[PDB]
């Protein structure tokens, strides 16, 4: 069941958008948010 | 100016618009005659004042008569409906700016119009009272004549006493068939009998504190009848058990529907008793109070029993009495539907998961040049996920089912024409050892789905038990429960899709009732109803050339039924069930057929539905989980089409029909609708043949294509799409938009859309044949997304893709290259999938070609 | 870039539901609304912003699938 | 075989419903009819001893389940409020300001008094 997230991130890197890649790069090293992003970040 | 008239003389007949306060009018003999008749009917408070000076001057009358109102509400057209707007505005039912809102006329969108129309109801009922008063004068003064709606203004008064004749006192007789029959559809629309819910029939006083234990109301029904329908010259049974024929059943149910909207809704539903089973008091249903059929008391009520049989156990488990009584009280503030009882301690919530995206086929398609920005074929069909408060937001849609009263004289002839439409199939009551069981894994309804599927109960009840249960149902009422659930399905819209599991105790007997008829309708080719006729092996071409058969100036037309499964009135569903049961003239007596009708009305019309985790009351509509809904919908469709044709043939000015046969047919149609209560089989056959000639329908469940003589419908001798709009507005309480109704003038371009498919003529085998092709984006959607069942075995995925390719083959003849690319892509993909694992090899194109030619007609 | 973001949203809500997000009624309703709004999106930047919003509730949630290793 | 199983299951369900219904209210309602035959929609209405109100929004909590409430011409007092996730929401939590913080709808379970 762990391969579902791997293929999801494969598709995400296939998209290659500025916002999505920025958010994933941030969350890579723990700098994640806490609430849903509106249309609460830590560290 | 144009005013609606109800006319019947030696040269014209119908209810149509013809060209003609203190109205003034103009024969010496007629002058003296009207003067004498008025002088004899002068003292009645329902007559308007008349001034005989040479002219006949009437005084203090409205601008529109009740005929104008009945017409505007029965021939509605949002383009030209200024008279309805003027009527609504003038009597303070709404304001002028109300008609600046969008979709105000619509019932689904902006249901507040049901509050504006209702603001006429009292006025309406006032007129009704006046009517009775008027007739009293004519019964006490010796006056014989017919009552026409175009004589009673909107304030209730009457005038125009020219048709009447002087006779012996105390014996004058009014005839009120046309009047009441044309007023009937708008009695419930405006809620005319609301003031009967109050103490002394006054809208400025509290509602009657009706005893909670009271359920019969038969005396009050007869009182209301005698009060408003005093001169209706036909025996009215408050309980439809006493009728003599299914026409009597329809006739009396059409009145009980109107009279049941003045009583507390806690008095309907199953009537229960405390019986003693082996000493312990159970609560079981010993009757049922239908809003349509009155009170029915079961005949085999056994008390002080020693032990129970398996059949009795099924009748008791399905008995909601033990469930609604022994549960907790439920006040459900999420919906306005009547809530009965929560059977659990906490409300349950149900969700729907997203689709299971197949990435392999998608990458394959992108490698095959598809899904380019600017392509004509897209991905538009997804599995939408649903949150918790979804199912109830589905159930609340039943707020679109309203109480609807019908034109009883019109319906009593439309039912004969519809029975003629079905007069070629076999039917009757079959035994238990002849029922052919489809999908032995269907849900068995609540509370039966707690222990197994329908297969379980079919294998536990021997044939004798099923026969005994059928006989029981033919003498008693079993108000079973259904269970609503959310459905996993593909759609281009995110709306919630639901399936209703009807209990096994209802389907087990509905099958023994309707199996022979359904099989005979499914095994016939060339009729008006096409159910069970595969589009394969020329079937589509044959069906199209059957609809095309002999229409003179052929045009094609189609329509939709907005909120069909939710808003279909109970009167028309009872009519459909009676049309279907009309085959039982050698296997059932009249009482047997009425008990079957009552069982069905309790089980599939106004049953108790367990939604979420509780039990609510279903106000009406069809249950998609019943085997007989696909055919009852076809009966409803044929009824609506025949009704549109009747209202098109009548509402046209018979003085401009340059034909003689058509004018005589219209005259005879009026004679057979509101006169000659006995059915005239000769004219019924004449009208059926006329329709077959000039209006040829192809009808599957709530889906229809029509080939019609365009020159007639150009003059009004045949139903048009505006006629279906009017009929659906005044009979189905739903608005039909012409943005979803298609008309096609060329017959080479076949039906624009029938059964969610398209048609095009192609040259195949040196012969031009009509082939159906589907929307390509739907097939791409069904290929890219699956429902998470084929992920464990490749065989089912291969079979789904082969079915999609079969469905996709005809696009190879479409002129758009990208459309044939779809089938070629499917074929490449299935060749791949077969590599992973001559006319029977599913991996070559000649296995699919042979599915669409009648020269290889096997399965 | 329209079909790709749509199937990405499909698999993203698949993962979200797989992580028992459906046990929080409010958060699951938010995720369902965003998914259904992406599946009806007829423009690419709105789909992308709804997609990053829907990914937020995946990478803001901790105890979920790891991301530093992928 | 399985017929015996479904008979036993139906019997057990019928008995678990049967041993939670009879009381003075049920007989006091049934014995005032014509021949002891009342509608079904009024046995859980004026005989039951526990009400479950499904409140979707704060307004329908104010006007319906204020801090006692009368329903079915009786007296109930709001108690044991429960949100969509089956978490005991104290009556203090259900306010105007703090309403978006708790997952609607709420389910109030009230005893008959």
Residue numbers in the entry:
A (entry chain D): 84 to 122, 129 to 132
B (entry chain A): 31 to 50, 69 to 74, 76 to 102, 112 to 895, 911 to 932
C (entry chain C): 2 to 71
D (entry chain B): 78 to 144, 146 to 191
Article, verbatim:
A key component, the RNA-dependent RNA polymerase [(RdRp), also known as nsp12], catalyzes the synthesis of viral RNA and thus plays a central role in the replication and transcription cycle of COVID-19 virus, possibly with the assistance of nsp7 and nsp8 as cofactors. The polymerase domain and NiRAN domain are connected by an interface domain (residues A250 to R365).
We have also observed C301 to C306 and C487 to C645 form disulfide bonds in the absence of DTT. After the collection and processing of 7994 micrograph movies, we obtained a 2.9-Å resolution three-dimensional reconstruction of an nsp12 monomer in complex with one nsp7-nsp8 pair and an nsp8 monomer, as was previously observed for SARS-CoV. In the COVID-19 virus structure, we additionally resolved residues A4 to R118. These constitute a structural block with five antiparallel β strands and two helices.
